[PDB]
């Protein structure tokens, strides 16, 4: 199947005194592997997955230096953006950056991305061709002109097609025992009665990896969406994921309803009944 490496960065200004809170996290697919927190004692990029510890002291020195550069750009950014938007010094503001690369089943480059937000809103993003920019407003258009003069897209494209792809390939090999393994959802169903005429059926999927999954109800073999509740896919905390979907049914008619699970760890779609 396909794979990705993605980095996420949040900086939140602290008006009264000092520099912003900066948090960086790195992912391969749904596995977090590195972190940096400016409020932490070490002031180093830290491992969050056993397989990244394979990497030597040069790696960690290099990543630390780069993540600190990221942090300084963000600090500069908060001040510039405050200027662009004519805002006071009194309020706390936020910048968010995400970037990374996708590869298909053959592990070849599929797409790359680099997007940026200010106070939760689209600011500027690299386009799919990795050659041009999407600026949301006139502040972002000023940045686009600046990044065009300086050929920023060209530098990002090289990373996204090269290093990004090359180091994801490297990470997938080193962590193959977990990263290249699929864990099938463990499924069951529960029953509840609200009154002597109405019942709830809940279909559970547990302990699955990767996070992507589809859970749906059918009634007499037709898709049923009305009277269903589908929760957001949630982390178990051991690296696996969980999700459920529920349907409300007339008591006694439970047998008409089937739950259907699709997941990349299941060669065939699974079906459950009460």
């Amino acid at each position: 199947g396909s794979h990705s490496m993605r980095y996420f960065f949040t900086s939140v200004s602290r008006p009264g005194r000092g520099e912003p809170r900066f948090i960086a996290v790195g992912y391969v697919d749904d596995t977090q592997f590195v972190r940096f927190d400016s409020d932490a004692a070490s002031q180093r990029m830290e491992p969050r997955a056993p397989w990244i510890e394979q990497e030597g002291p040069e790696y960690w020195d290099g990543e630390t230096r780069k993540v600190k550069a990221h942090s300084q750009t963000h600090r500069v950014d908060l001040g510039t953006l405050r200027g662009y938007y004519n805002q006071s010094e009194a309020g706390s503001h936020t910048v968010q950056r995400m970037y990374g690369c996708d590869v298909g089943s053959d592990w070849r480059f599929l797409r790359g991305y680099h997007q940026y937000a200010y106070d939760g809103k689209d600011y500027i993003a690299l386009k799919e061709d990795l050659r041009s920019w999407t600026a949301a407003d006139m502040a972002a258009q000023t940045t686009k002109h600046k990044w065009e003069a300086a050929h920023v897209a060209e530098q990002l494209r090289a990373y996204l097609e090269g290093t990004c792809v090359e180091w994801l390939r490297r990470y997938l090999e080193n962590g193959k025992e977990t990263l290249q393994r699929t864990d099938a959802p463990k499924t069951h169903m529960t029953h509840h009665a609200v009154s002597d005429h109405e019942a709830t059926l809940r279909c559970w999927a547990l302990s699955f990896y990767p996070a992507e999954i589809t859970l749906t109800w059918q009634r007499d073999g037709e898709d049923q969406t009305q009277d269903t509740e589908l929760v957001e896919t949630r982390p178990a905390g051991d690296g696996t994921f969980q999700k459920w979907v529920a349907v409300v049914v007339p008591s006694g008619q439970e047998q008409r309803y089937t739950c259907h699970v699709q997941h990349e760890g299941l060669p065939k779609p699974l079906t459950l009944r009460w």
Partner: peptide, 9 residues
Amino acid sequence: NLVPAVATV
């Protein structure tokens, strides 16, 4: 492996 450089806005 992080991008070598990050341009400011």
